[PDB]
Amino acid sequence: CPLMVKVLDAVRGSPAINVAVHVFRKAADDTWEPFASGKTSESGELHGLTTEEEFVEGIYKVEIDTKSYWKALGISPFHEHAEVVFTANDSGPRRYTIAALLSPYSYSTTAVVTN
Amino acid sequence: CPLMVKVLDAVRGSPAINVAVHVFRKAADDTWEPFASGKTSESGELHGLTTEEEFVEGIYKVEIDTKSYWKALGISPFHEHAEVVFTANDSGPRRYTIAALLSPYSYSTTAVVTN
Amino acid sequence: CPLMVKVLDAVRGSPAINVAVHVFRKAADDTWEPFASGKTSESGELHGLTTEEEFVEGIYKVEIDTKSYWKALGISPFHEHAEVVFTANDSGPRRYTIAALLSPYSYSTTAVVTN
Amino acid sequence: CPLMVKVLDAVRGSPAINVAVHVFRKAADDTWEPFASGKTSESGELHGLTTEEEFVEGIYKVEIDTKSYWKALGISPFHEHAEVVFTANDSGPRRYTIAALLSPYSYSTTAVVTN
Numbered sequence A, B, C, D: 001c002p003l004m005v006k007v008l009d010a011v012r013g014s015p016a017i018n019v020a021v022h023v024f025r026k027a028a029d030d031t032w033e034p035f036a037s038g039k040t041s042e043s044g045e046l047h048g049l050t051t052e053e054e055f056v057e058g059i060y061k062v063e064i065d066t067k068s069y070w071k072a073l074g075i076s077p078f079h080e081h082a083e084v085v086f087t088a089n090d091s092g093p094r095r096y097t098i099a100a101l102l103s104p105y106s107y108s109t110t111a112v113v114t115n
């Protein structure tokens, strides 16, 4: 599992469940092509987005749909989404965990990269 | 000053100086068109981006060039940039401050919206 | 102003106003003795805590009463308070800003140390 | 496992390994009595601090030795440690995960509380 996403809710102190996540990869013409998508589980984790074969070098964008998450909880948040944009696999295959910690007017994102 | 940006460096414990910031407004065809830009000052702040007359309701993207900032310090970064996307909504007088706290493999962003 | 404290609210996207802050200095017997205190202003800032003459090298603790802040807003918090513990070191002119970004089940703190 | 601690390094994008963690519980005389301690593994996780029987109601303090972590990496950090202070189990037993994200001049902490 080369790309995993974890989302936590800083208001409730819980995993953020059922958060939609869309991954894009920059194409040769510099547009964002759709790459993979999914939603977080009851643990706040999203596994199975991609495979070692599919997850080639490139510039990837992970768009976490934080607005829909907050709206479903009856909350009007500030951001449209949380975006993480990074170059992947430039020195060979790595495993990436993108973590996001959500508040209505704030978010933090961190990456854990392992070989 | 309806829109201000502040950037902090969590490695050195200092304002993030000379960071390029580009602001875009979402156009009717869903593209991002340039709206305002600048570089943070010695205090890590970027003032004078826009005026009340031109800062209308809409979806805005603030792109902070974190990768170039880290490279100028000789520090290896993860992200290509930090992207903060939000809707500006007229509800009485409102000033927007977008703050970003930068680390090489993590960033936090928050919005301070005051009257 | 050698020591300033700033507190932000990540749920409401606002300065955290009227937050009690107590500063302690570590004494020779390893106990924490009161040094300075106050409440954040309408801008979320607490100025005038100490003077350059009295703010000597040492270990300091900044206790932010986050629990009372959240209770006054009717929001259920996790932490009893936020504690920021650091050594002040004389190395040329130095001003210390301790910033805290508050959510009910999370907080971030950073130090901005300038000349 | 009712109390677990996870620590990540925001400079390297990795688990923070071999971080010492000391847990205290407030005694009847209002002093901090030692409760449990350990160090993070290669995954940045610390398991086995306590048991369901031992982890009674009370006010607990989790002190994460961030200064030693940074010093071992040849880095001079700002904070002495990262402290998390919270009331536990007041509405019955819960499971607590305390996560900490570390930078030399900044840290974030979050709690995930499950039933």
Ligand SMILES: Oc1c(Cl)cc(Cl)cc1Sc1cc(Cl)cc(Cl)c1O
Residues within 6 Å of the ligand: A006, A007, A008, A097, A098, A099, A100, A101, A110, A111, A112, D006, D007, D008, D099, D100, D101
């Ligand atoms: O989701 C997390 C956040 Cl927001 C902060 C911290 Cl200090 C830990 C976690 S869990 C987690 C996050 C990442 Cl990037 C990698 C792994 Cl292996 C985790 O367990």
Ligand SMILES: [Ca+2]
Residues within 6 Å of the ligand: A057, A089, A090, A091, A092
């Ligand atoms: Ca390559």
Ligand SMILES: [Ca+2]
Residues within 6 Å of the ligand: B057, B089, B090
């Ligand atoms: Ca409107």
Ligand SMILES: [Ca+2]
Residues within 6 Å of the ligand: C057, C089, C090
């Ligand atoms: Ca000294």
Ligand SMILES: [Ca+2]
Residues within 6 Å of the ligand: D057, D089, D090, D091, D092
């Ligand atoms: Ca009870």
